[PDB]
Paper text:
MxnB crystals belonged to space group P1 and diffracted to 1.67 Å. The crystals contained one biological dimer in the asymmetric unit and the refined model includes residues 8–335 in chain A and 7–335 in chain B. The MxnB monomer displays the overall typical ketosynthase fold consisting of a five-layered core structure, α-β-α-β-α, similar to that of thiolase I.24 Although the sequence identity of MxnB to E. coli FabH is low (29%), pairwise alignment of the structures gives a Cα rmsd of just 1.5 Å over 254 (monomer) and 2.1 Å over 508 (dimer) residues, respectively. The active site of MxnB contains the catalytic CHN triad (C121, H264 and N292). The active site C121 is oxidized to cysteine sulfinic acid, but this modification appears to be either transient or a result of crystallization/data collection, since LC-MS analysis of the intact protein showed the expected mass for MxnB with unmodified cysteines. In MxnB the catalytic C121 is located at a crossroads between two substrate-binding tunnels. The first, canonical, tunnel (red) and the second (blue) tunnel, positioned as proposed for OleA, have amphipathic character (based on electrostatic surface potential maps generated in ccp4mg28). The position of the catalytic C121 in relation to both tunnel entrances strongly suggests that binding of substrate in the blue tunnel and its subsequent transacylation from the CP to MxnB C121 results in the obstruction of the red tunnel entrance. Therefore, we propose that binding of substrate in the red tunnel would have to precede binding in the blue tunnel. In agreement with the biochemical data, we propose that the western chain is preferentially delivered to and/or bound in the red tunnel, while the eastern chain is preferentially supplied via the blue tunnel.
Myxopyronins are α-pyrone antibiotics produced by the terrestrial bacterium Myxococcus fulvus Mx f50 and possess antibacterial activity against Gram-positive and Gram-negative pathogens. Using in vitro assays we show that MxnB catalyzes a unique condensation reaction forming the α-pyrone ring of myxopyronins from two activated acyl chains in form of their β-keto intermediates. MxnB belongs to the thiolase superfamily of proteins that catalyzes the formation of carbon–carbon bonds via Claisen condensation. BLAST search results identified MxnB as a homolog of FabH, a β-ketoacyl-[acyl carrier protein (ACP)] synthase III (KAS III), highlighted by the presence of the archetypical cysteine–histidine–asparagine (CHN) catalytic triad.
Author numbering:
A (entry chain B): 7 to 335
B (entry chain A): 8 to 335
Write the structure that this text describes.
Amino acid sequence: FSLPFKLAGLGRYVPEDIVLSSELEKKYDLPQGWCLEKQGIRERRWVKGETAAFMGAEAAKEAVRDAGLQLSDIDLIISASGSPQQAVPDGGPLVQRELGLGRSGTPAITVNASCLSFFVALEVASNYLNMRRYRRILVVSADIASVSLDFRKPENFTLFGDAAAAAVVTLPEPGEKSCIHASHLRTYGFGAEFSEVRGGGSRKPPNSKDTRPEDNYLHMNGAELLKIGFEYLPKFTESLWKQCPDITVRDVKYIIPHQPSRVVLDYLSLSYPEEKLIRIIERFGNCIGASMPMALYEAVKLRGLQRGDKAVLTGTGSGVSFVGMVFTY
Amino acid sequence: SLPFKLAGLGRYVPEDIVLSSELEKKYDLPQGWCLEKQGIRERRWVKGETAAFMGAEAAKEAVRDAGLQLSDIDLIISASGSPQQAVPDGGPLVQRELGLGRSGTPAITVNASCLSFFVALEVASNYLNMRRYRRILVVSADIASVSLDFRKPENFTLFGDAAAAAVVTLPEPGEKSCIHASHLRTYGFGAEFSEVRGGGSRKPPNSKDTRPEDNYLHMNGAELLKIGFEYLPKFTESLWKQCPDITVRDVKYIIPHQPSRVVLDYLSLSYPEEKLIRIIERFGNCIGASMPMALYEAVKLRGLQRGDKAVLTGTGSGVSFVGMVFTY
Ligand SMILES: [Cl-]
Ligand code: NA
Ligand code: NA
């Protein structure tokens, strides 16, 4: 069985300011080439005043044009960023307002699976489409990580960049092969503490003096995160590909990963031909929720993924969750 | 109609009752001010609890109520109006809290501010009817009390803490549970009329340009009301047009999100009192937990029975409107 599903248009926004790793290396006394070797990052983009809703709206406008549509044709907006612009309201109504659709009534909501929100939003969208509830759905991921960096830790502040990307999804028309062949999501909440920001909510509120600045930074336990993979990834991979026994990785053109560090790409490059891998981290850094849809944009707009080609979206994110999808574009 | 069954319901009520009379004494408010102006006699405030703890207690009750074990749940959707913390989201946190941290059971968040529960029900209904998942837990837990602005009586007397949850499934053959009509509209031009500017990249907590005020709720009541004056009649018509053979007269209960007495006051001018489910007097505005708490009370205390029709409805920050007509 395959599920009809079309990525009808794609869009991106990247901030103008290119922050070279060499520049970060001089200012914070790191060795020349440290970022490239340790993080796999030559450069990243950082905002200089724009909001996350602004970035998302710019990406969305490109996606809507790319799909041959007007903004008034969109009948549902799903905001799918890795981090919020602000606490209230959610990213949905904020990007709806930014797009000039603030009086349209067009439903605008958020789907949140931390840095894997884009994937889960596509899934939610695919069900709305196949239930015929909505017809033309905007999915928008925009993240600004540069304002939350921990400059105590080079592993942190050299890692993150800012970006947005977006997709419009529809049901395919007759003669279009666009579809999902397999999809899988697993969550291992025992890993929550191994990639966590304790602040940003009711647990450690910003105005509470019981809160400490460090609560507002990301803490990771790399060793323990990797163990979740050692324990559960082979099973995850098997369950996914189980779903489409007539399709193997040999049949797909591109593997399109969420890429929060060089480790995922290094692992994939040991396993799969390099030509199949979509790389964006070296130029955009870890852009949280925007990483996977930026890689998708790259695959289509820079690397020639064509309609009828097969590809795989895949990723691991805070939670800890695993996602994968095998699809015909 | 869309097959859809509320298989089990659960709640968590923090122990501490915070009397309006006490808030009025401590903060120099007239006696009876909260009840007259806010419709609130008391609310519950947490002591040690995390949002995940509250959600897990409500979930356990909902899963038991549905005749299930926790191991039977195949998707968790966290649907609170406020987050426990920035990373990870509420789903993995309540999954861990429930002892399912090594289960693999997918756990995600649906966020439509204080209307998250409604939108999570919708998302769940589509997963169910697509046959992707069979037994979906929806959990709404909010702790508002730690974010109150004690400069503003309209703020700090309004909010309380609570959790509620549902397990949803497809009905069995012969069972009449279904959704007859459902509608959601968003008017993002209203974003600034109910807003917290902090809590993210726009006004990061550690930034020197972020002020304490950025982390408090700001509301413009006059402008919020105008959104209703302009768009609510159209919303209501659009909802009920989906189910011509059903009118409000066929409905046993109207079950509203209750962010202030204004919504109840509006409904009570319009509809028989006996149809309204009220919780604000005892819980205050508990954000995302309000609607599912009212749903819990409709079933468990006011005797909504299988086959009865009801309406879930609400207005939330955004600004969005939601409504659903269903057979329980
Ligand atoms: Cl609708
Ligand atoms: Na009193
Ligand atoms: Na929303």
